[PDB]
């Protein structure tokens, strides 16, 4: 799978066609990285685009469902196999940071 690369801050890239495209194992990385970031009832063309944030960060007691939905999004991605993810800090102020690790379809060629 190809996909246009995004630069550091994550804006789009035009020019260098066929070269601003991520090849693989990093295309999966980019595609998971910003599949997580796709609020659900945003896109009128995909209203279940990805997990529903306005209804999960605005309600108490969803950490388990945040994690289950992140695993859902990641696993249902073209190119990933497994996941290994949990929470690493405990809302250091009130923001919790979770650690997400997944095995792409690559690095399994032995």
């Amino acid at each position: 799978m190809r996909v246009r690369t995004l630069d550091d801050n994550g804006d789009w890239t035009f020019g260098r066609g066929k070269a601003d495209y991520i090849t693989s194992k990093k295309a999966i990385a980019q595609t998971v990285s910003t599949r997580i970031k796709s609020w659900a009832n945003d896109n009128p063309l995909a209203m279940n685009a990805n997990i529903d944030w306005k209804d999960l960060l605005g309600r108490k007691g969803t950490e388990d469902t945040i994690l289950r939905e992140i695993e859902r999004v990641v696993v249902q991605t073209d190119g990933v196999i497994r996941v290994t993810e949990l929470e690493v800090i405990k809302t250091e102020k009130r923001v919790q940071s979770i650690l997400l690790s997944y095995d792409t379809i690559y690095d399994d060629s032995e």
């Binding site: 990385a29 990285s33 997580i36 969803t62 945040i66 290994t84 919790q96 940071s97 979770i98 650690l99």
Partner: peptide, 15 residues
Amino acid sequence: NAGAVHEEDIIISVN
């Protein structure tokens, strides 16, 4: 107080 959450700093484990 119960431990509510407001943001999410998901860290992708780089390989």
